[PDB]
Amino acid sequence: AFQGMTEYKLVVVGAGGVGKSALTIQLIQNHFVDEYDPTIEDSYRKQVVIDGETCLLDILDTAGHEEYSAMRDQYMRTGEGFLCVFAINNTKSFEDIHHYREQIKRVKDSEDVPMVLVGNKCDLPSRTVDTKQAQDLARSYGIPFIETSAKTRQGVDDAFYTLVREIRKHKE
Numbered sequence: 627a628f629q630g631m632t633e634y635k636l637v638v639v640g641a642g643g644v645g646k647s648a649l650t651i652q653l654i655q656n657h658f659v660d661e662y663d664p665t666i667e668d669s670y671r672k673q674v675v676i677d678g679e680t681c682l683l684d685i686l687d688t689a690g691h692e693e694y695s696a697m698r699d700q701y702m703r704t705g706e707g708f709l710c711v712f713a714i715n716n717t718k719s720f721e722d723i724h725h726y727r728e729q730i731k732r733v734k735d736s737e738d739v740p741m742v743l744v745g746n747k748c749d750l751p752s753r754t755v756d757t758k759q760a761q762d763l764a765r766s767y768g769i770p771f772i773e774t775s776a777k778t779r780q781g782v783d784d785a786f787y788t789l790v791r792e793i794r795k796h797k798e
């Protein structure tokens with residue numbers, strides 16, 4: 627029966643420049659990317675142990691704005707869980723979260739899709755989104771909220787591991 631470790635397909639979504647790539651590269655390479663090189667689509671893989679279970683994370687790092695609609699629908703269909711990322715110094719990115727979540731719910735035709743709300747750049751001083759407002763949004767969705775910094779690494783492992791735990795709860 628066991629043919630190899632369990633694989634989880636994770637998709638990182640959110641507005642341009644919120645730190646999707648930086649979060650992922652911090653997880654994979656333990657490296658902070660200071661440059662802003664806009665992504666088209668990149669795939670990463672990492673084996674980790676979460677709650678005593680070995681797993682392979684297949685992580686799709688997406689473009690903030692994806693014009694080809696058909697490619698976007700494809701990764702939403704294939705993804706098992708979604709990190710919905712905003713930047714705590716960018717109110718507009720926070721307002722956009724609702725739109726990412728709606729699109730995902732429509733493609734998966736479900737109210738109950740594994741997701742984590744991620745407030746990134748929590749190292750920066752010019753916060754415009756209060757922690758309490760983000761926590762309230764996440765509570766309204768029934769999903770976890772995690773504050774992260776791709777720079778300091780605060781919350782980075784937690785965000786990805788929490789998402790895996792959400793997928794597991796959903797599969798059971």
Ligand SMILES: COc1nc(-c2cccc3c2O[C@H](CNC(=O)C2CCOCC2)CO3)ccc1Nc1cccc(CN(C)C)c1
Nearest residue numbers: 635636637669670671684685686697700701702704705706
């Ligand atoms: C392609 O398989 C993967 N898939 C995902 C993945 C995770 C979550 C959702 C996904 C994903 O890819 C899917 C594969 N893509 C598609 O089917 C595309 C093909 C072109 O038209 C549009 C659809 C789409 O949705 C993430 C990582 C990998 N793969 C990967 C990552 C890093 C390293 C390697 C190994 N390589 C460097 C030797 C493989």
Ligand SMILES: Nc1nc2c(ncn2[C@@H]2O[C@H](COP(=O)(O)OP(=O)(O)NP(=O)(O)O)[C@@H](O)[C@H]2O)c(=O)[nH]1
Nearest residue numbers: 642643644645646647648660664665690747775776
């Ligand atoms: N101080 C700080 N800067 C960050 C953080 N995360 C990302 N950045 C910076 O924000 C800029 C954008 O990051 P990047 O990961 O490219 O964002 P993205 O969401 O992948 N953009 P795209 O959607 O175009 O692919 C980069 O200059 C990066 O260094 C963080 O937690 N703290």
Ligand SMILES: [Mg+2]
Nearest residue numbers: 646647664665
């Ligand atoms: Mg990127």
